[PDB]
Swiss-Prot record, chain A:
Lineage of the species this protein comes from: Bacteria, Pseudomonadati, Pseudomonadota, Gammaproteobacteria, Enterobacterales
GO cellular component: cytoplasm; cytosol; cytosolic DNA-directed RNA polymerase complex; membrane; transcription elongation factor complex
Family under the similarity heading: Belongs to the RNA polymerase alpha chain family.
UniProt entry keywords in alphabetical sequence: Acetylation, ADP-ribosylation, DNA-directed RNA polymerase, Nucleotidyltransferase, Transcription, Transferase
EC number(s) reported in the record: 2.7.7.6
Post-translational modification: (Microbial infection) ADP-ribosylated on both alpha subunits by the phage T4 protein ModA. ADP-ribosylated on only one of the alpha subunits by the phage T4 protein Alt.
Function: DNA-dependent RNA polymerase (RNAP) catalyzes the transcription of DNA into RNA using the four ribonucleoside triphosphates as substrates. This subunit plays an important role in subunit assembly since its dimerization is the first step in the sequential assembly of subunits to form the holoenzyme.
Gene coding for it: rpoA
Keyword Transferase: yes
Organism name: Escherichia coli (strain K12)
Gene Ontology biological process terms, A to Z: bacterial-type flagellum assembly; bacterial-type flagellum-dependent cell motility; cell motility; cellular response to cell envelope stress; DNA-templated transcription initiation; intracellular iron ion homeostasis; nitrate assimilation; regulation of DNA-templated transcription elongation
Region ranges (Required for interaction with Crp at class II promoters): 159-162
Highest taxon in the source lineage: Bacteria
Protein name as catalogued: DNA-directed RNA polymerase subunit alpha
Impact noted for substituting R42C: In rpoA112; temperature-sensitive, blocks RNA polymerase assembly
Enzyme class per UniProt: transferase
Swiss-Prot record, chain B:
Full-length numbering of the shown residues: 697 to 796 of 1342
Biotechnology: Co-administration of salinamide and rifampicin or salinamide and myxopyronin suppresses the emergence of resistance to both antibiotics.
Upper lineage: Bacteria, Pseudomonadati, Pseudomonadota, Gammaproteobacteria, Enterobacterales
Gene: rpoB
Species, as recorded: Escherichia coli (strain K12)
Assembly behavior: The RNAP catalytic core consists of 2 alpha, 1 beta, 1 beta' and 1 omega subunit. When a sigma factor is associated with the core the holoenzyme is formed, which can initiate transcription. The rRNA transcription and antitermination complex (rrnTAC) consists of RNAP, NusA, NusB, NusE (rpsJ), NusG, SubB, ribosomal protein S4, DNA and precursor rRNA; S4 is more flexible than other subunits. In pull-down experiments interacts with CedA. (Microbial infection) Interacts (via flap domain) with Escherichia phage lambda antitermination protein Q; this interaction renders bacterial RNAP resistant to transcription pausing and allows it to read through termination signals.
Family under the similarity heading: Belongs to the RNA polymerase beta chain family.
Post-translational modification: Acetylated on several lysine residues in the presence of glucose.
Protein name: DNA-directed RNA polymerase subunit beta
General function of this protein: DNA-dependent RNA polymerase (RNAP) catalyzes the transcription of DNA into RNA using the four ribonucleoside triphosphates as substrates.
UniProtKB/Swiss-Prot annotation, chain C:
Post-translational modification summary for this protein: Acetylated on several lysine residues in the presence of glucose.
Job of this protein: DNA-dependent RNA polymerase (RNAP) catalyzes the transcription of DNA into RNA using the four ribonucleoside triphosphates as substrates.
Listed name of the protein: DNA-directed RNA polymerase subunit beta'
Subunit-structure text: The RNAP catalytic core consists of 2 alpha, 1 beta, 1 beta' and 1 omega subunit. When a sigma factor is associated with the core the holoenzyme is formed, which can initiate transcription. The rRNA transcription and antitermination complex (rrnTAC) consists of RNAP, NusA, NusB, NusE (rpsJ), NusG, SubB, ribosomal protein S4, DNA and precursor rRNA; S4 is more flexible than other subunits.
The gene coding this protein: rpoC
Transmembrane segments: none
Residues of the full protein shown: 490 to 538 of 1407
Source organism of this protein record: Escherichia coli (strain K12)
Practical and industrial applications: Co-administration of salinamide and rifampicin or salinamide and myxopyronin suppresses the emergence of resistance to both antibiotics.
Family affiliation: Belongs to the RNA polymerase beta' chain family.
């Protein structure tokens, strides 16, 4: 017929690690693999909701280039480490966590105060290296539920909300997707070979399974076309 | 036709024998995909002559390189013509201009 | 992969791979996103895409 | 003269416009040179050589 | 409110001409329009069903490389002209039209005897010219419905009965959409000041309704997305 279209049946999913997926789909209509891969990649990159750190308050530090004698790492390193942390906040939009550590300083994410609702996927994720014995670190972390990637450069404008000193803006990175790529290869069925095969390689920060992220992206894209369906 | 040319296409097409040029001026009495019959002007008439020029175009005849030689009329019914005017376009020729 | 005549490698990019790598590995002055701090190459790619 | 003729139409004088990738979609980083060129098909066909 | 997404919908279908048309979808959130727009375009270029001419039959012809007396254009030229004919057929996927013309003049598409269900969108389209008073042309045109572009070589693959001599085969271009141009602009919706609207300009042959084409493309996209939604 004319309305019938080929659907990918050889759904092969192999997990390199707990947060790494390589999904192969075939057969596909000529050129359809590119559309599917691009749409899924765009939705994953700029449309996946998630909870992540937004701004960080550090006691004794007033600026990004300020230096703390207690920690061997710079403030920029601390901001990068906090940005790399993945959270699974549920229930409410934004949560405030308090971190207080002293003594030996292999301070990881496990030392954060547990609020019950908040969840930490990787408690062993290192945060800072306090070398001095008596030096102590105290900080406040704000986590918000947003969508996509929100760099601090855009949030620099309209500073009236962040008027109090000691608050440093960090990149949000709400979407739990990193290194999402798609490749299209030749596939042969019977006599036809113009069909395409789509290989999607993706990783997640650990909040959700990569296949769960793919399912959520596909569901979002499908429900975005509900009014246009026949 | 070439959008960018040098103006020498007309001379190359006319000088080559691929195209059918009008030997005498007149009007196209009967234009057909296989032959063209034109009525010569009274000025170019000859004594004891009917005054009709017939051009038989060569269609789908192989060349020395096993290509196709086709001539198609480029004039309509009743269109006046002059001496030296192209009547049919030869292979790789558009309106008397070389078109490779 | 090595030429027996002199030992020099034979598998080398020639025309398009070299141009693409040169364009990718080039620095502007006031390009968009300059001065940012990234946690790794994956974040850099996700920013570029 | 070529630039003046381009200005006569609704085309840029530089002769380069911004193209969009057909497969992917976004704008190309730099303008590309597009136009109309006379192409010839030489008498060297692959079916005659295979 | 971050979890929920605004639902896009058709808001305006401005038909500039019988072929040129514009379709407006609103509202769209962030880059979704792009993620939609190109996708829709990349579908509308390749997977649009349409009707095209497959086989031709002329009484006084024997092969594609012959000529007929009294006709100005060549048989191959006539087939090429018939290839570009745009016809909208509803109710069935097979129609055998007949054309009979005589006398000096052009042979437009209006000379085809309509069968009611079959509709011709370009009656002024020219097929050939007759340059003789005692010249009559009779043609039988076979039109079918399909997708994409198939040449004669792949279509003559089915070898079960040899076609009679004089049944010319022409290439079929079933796709009725020629040009698609999508763009995304700011949409004034409530107070968000960030929602966007998508405008799609379509240049077709007039045989497909723009809304039907958009709905068909969306349905195809959803059908392909169902497999990813399931994912084993």
């Amino acid at each position: 017929s004319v309305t019938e279209f080929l659907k990918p049946r050889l759904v092969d999913i192999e997990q390199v690690s707990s947060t790494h997926a390589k999904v192969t789909l075939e057969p596909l209509e000529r050129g359809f693999g590119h559309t599917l891969g691009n749409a899924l990649r765009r939705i994953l990159l700029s449309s996946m909701p998630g909870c992540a750190v937004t701004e960080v308050e550090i006691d004794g530090v007033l600026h990004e280039y300020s230096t703390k004698e207690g920690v061997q790492e710079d403030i920029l390193e601390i901001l990068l480490n906090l940005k790399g942390l993945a959270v699974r906040v549920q229930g409410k939009d934004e949560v405030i966590l308090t971190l207080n550590k002293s003594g030996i300083g292999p301070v990881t994410a496990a030392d954060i105060t547990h609020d019950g609702d908040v969840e930490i996927v990787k408690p062993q994720h290192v945060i800072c290296h306090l070398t001095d014995e008596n030096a102590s670190i105290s900080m406040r972390i704000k986590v918000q539920r947003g969508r996509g990637y929100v760099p601090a450069s855009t949030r620099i404008h309209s500073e009236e909300d962040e008027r109090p000193i000691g608050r440093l803006l960090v990149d949000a990175c709400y979407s739990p997707v990193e290194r999402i790529a798609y490749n299209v290869e030749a596939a042969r069925v019977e006599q036809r070979t113009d069909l395409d095969k789509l290989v999607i390689e993706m990783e997640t920060n650990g909040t959700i399974d990569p296949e769960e992220a793919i399912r959520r992206a596909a569901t979002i894209l499908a429900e975005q076309l509900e009014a246009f369906v026949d | 036709k070439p959008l960018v040319g040098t103006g020498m296409e007309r001379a190359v097409a006319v000088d080559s024998g691929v195209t059918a040029v009008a030997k005498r001026g007149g009007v196209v009495q009967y234009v057909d995909a296989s032959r063209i019959v034109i009525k010569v002007n009274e000025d170019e008439m000859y004594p004891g002559e009917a005054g009709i020029d017939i051009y038989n175009l060569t269609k789908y005849t192989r060349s020395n390189q096993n290509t196709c030689i086709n001539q198609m009329p480029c004039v309509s019914l009743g269109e006046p013509v002059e001496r030296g005017d192209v009547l049919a376009d030869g292979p790789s020729t558009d309106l008397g201009e070389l078109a490779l | 992969i090595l030429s027996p005549a002199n030992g020099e490698p034979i598998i080398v990019p020639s025309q398009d791979v070299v141009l693409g790598l040169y364009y990718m590995t080039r620095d502007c002055v006031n390009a968009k996103g300059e001065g940012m701090v990234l946690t790794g190459p994956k974040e850099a790619e996700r920013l570029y895409r | 003269e070529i630039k003046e003729l381009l200005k006569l139409g609704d085309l840029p004088t530089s002769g380069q416009i911004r193209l969009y990738d057909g497969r992917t979609g976004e704008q190309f980083e730099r303008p590309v040179t597009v136009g109309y060129m006379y192409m010839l098909k030489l008498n060297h066909l692959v079916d005659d050589k295979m």
